């Protein structure tokens, strides 16, 4: 029925309008909680920048009386030792906004078409350890941070005591991670003039020859250097090792085909259909003929109730209506070409002469 569809369409809109008001309110609460969690990483960096503004003025003034700040107690504001970062600030695990991930990856594709992979050497272009070269070990695609296992990027970090034994030293040196924007790709190219291979820094990458596979939900693309069109091969990545566990079904059983369609008996007991869907849901679109027949007779019982006063009409009321039907069948007369030609003469005679 056409009136039963409006009922469903109206229900689908009422629920989607309520899911948006709830989702919006949750997007604002989750955002307000992360911003307050990231702010603790911004505060530690702000407190250490000012601590360095005062530590340098004392080394200048005191001279031979310079304190031994490495033997001091922790800072109760953040709980860090001297000259040590915090795990949240040394691993760069603080979530970043979506407009940041696109900025960090702006130089190498996009957050969903990233053109750098683990296993390819990069060069640092920011921070204290500029112009350093190392190989990418990990690639955190959530914060768009990269780990380079170089001994120069190590940094003291304070280990929280809830994950540390009582004999373990409180501070340890871990490999610090960098954002994707702070590193560029290094790949050896061939000198077209002399044919000698030398290393160069790739300033920009973009995806090429993208092709998706819908059945498998996979894709395969190529990365090239814009301006010069140098297709750079991907680095050797080892696929994850997939194994067969004892709890998993054997390959011979998962492939067995046992379904045989039927036409005179349902695929399953007819009672099961009441469990798969709700018989009385306002979102039901597949109705039975007996139901639609009962729904269409609600209007048929109104057109017969609106026109129920046609049995109380007087003879003159019935005569008028009966004539009206006959007249509407005559139609409108038409003007023949002969009549049109005679009208054109009148127009031309009264306009031009």
């Amino acid at each position: 029925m056409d009136k039963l569809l409006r009922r469903v369409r109206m229900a689908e809109g009422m629920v989607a309008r309520r899911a948006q008001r709830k989702n919006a309110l949750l997007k604002r609460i989750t955002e307000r909680k992360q911003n307050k969690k990231n702010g603790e990483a911004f505060t530690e960096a702000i407190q250490q920048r000012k601590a360095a503004v005062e530590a340098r003025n004392e080394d200048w003034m005191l001279g031979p009386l310079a304190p031994r700040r490495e033997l001091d107690e922790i800072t109760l504001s953040n709980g860090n030792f001297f000259g040590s970062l915090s795990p949240t600030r040394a691993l760069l695990e603080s979530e970043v906004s979506e407009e940041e991930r696109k900025a960090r990856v702006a130089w190498c594709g996009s957050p969903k078409f990233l053109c750098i992979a683990p296993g390819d050497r990069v060069v640092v272009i920011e921070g204290h350890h500029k112009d350093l070269i190392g190989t990418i070990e990990k690639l955190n695609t959530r914060n768009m941070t990269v780990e380079i296992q170089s001994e120069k990027l190590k940094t003291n970090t304070t280990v929280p005591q809830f994950m540390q034994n009582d004999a373990d030293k409180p501070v340890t040196q871990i490999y610090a991670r960098l954002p994707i924007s702070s590193v560029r790709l290094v790949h050896p190219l061939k000198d077209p003039q002399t044919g000698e291979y030398r290393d160069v820094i790739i300033r920009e990458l973009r995806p090429r020859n993208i092709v998706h596979d819908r059945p498998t939900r996979t894709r395969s693309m190529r990365r090239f250097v814009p301006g010069e069109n140098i297709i750079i091969p991907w680095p050797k990545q080892e696929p994850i090792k997939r194994e067969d566990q004892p709890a998993d079904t054997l390959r011979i059983d998962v492939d067995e085909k046992t379904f045989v369609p039927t036409l005179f008996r349902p695929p399953a007991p007819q009672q099961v259909l009441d469990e798969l869907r709700n018989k009385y849901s306002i979102f039901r679109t597949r109705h039975t003929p007996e139901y639609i027949a009962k729904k269409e007779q609600e209007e048929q019982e109104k057109e017969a109730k609106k026109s129920a006063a046609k049995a109380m009409l007087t003879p003159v009321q019935e005569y008028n209506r009966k004539q009206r039907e006959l007249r509407r069948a005559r139609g409108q007369p038409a003007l023949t070409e002969e009549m049109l030609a005679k009208i054109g003469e009148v127009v031309a005679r009264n306009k031009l002469g």
């Binding site: 005591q161 809830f162 994950m163």
Partner: protein
């Protein structure tokens, strides 16, 4: 039926609601069934109990301090 504490939609903010109560049933078996005894704390290494304990004590001490602050007090 076991009732659940009334709470606020967002922990410390929101309207006051009440979660769905819990139903427990005790069946009188015709054949006895006896549970095994829990493993000794020193024999729970398969579940990483050592690390789990350190983390549990940390949260226990942060929940206790946040209760000392709820009384309007601080640790000298």
């Amino acid at each position: 039926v076991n009732q659940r504490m009334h709470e606020q939609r967002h922990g410390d903010v929101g309207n006051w609601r009440r979660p769905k109560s819990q139903k427990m049933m005790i069946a009188e078996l015709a054949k006895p069934f006896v549970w095994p005894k829990p493993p000794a704390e020193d024999a729970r290494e398969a579940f990483d109990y050592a690390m789990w304990k350190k983390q549990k004590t940390a949260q226990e001490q942060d929940t206790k301090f946040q209760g000392i602050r709820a009384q309007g007090e601080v640790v000298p």
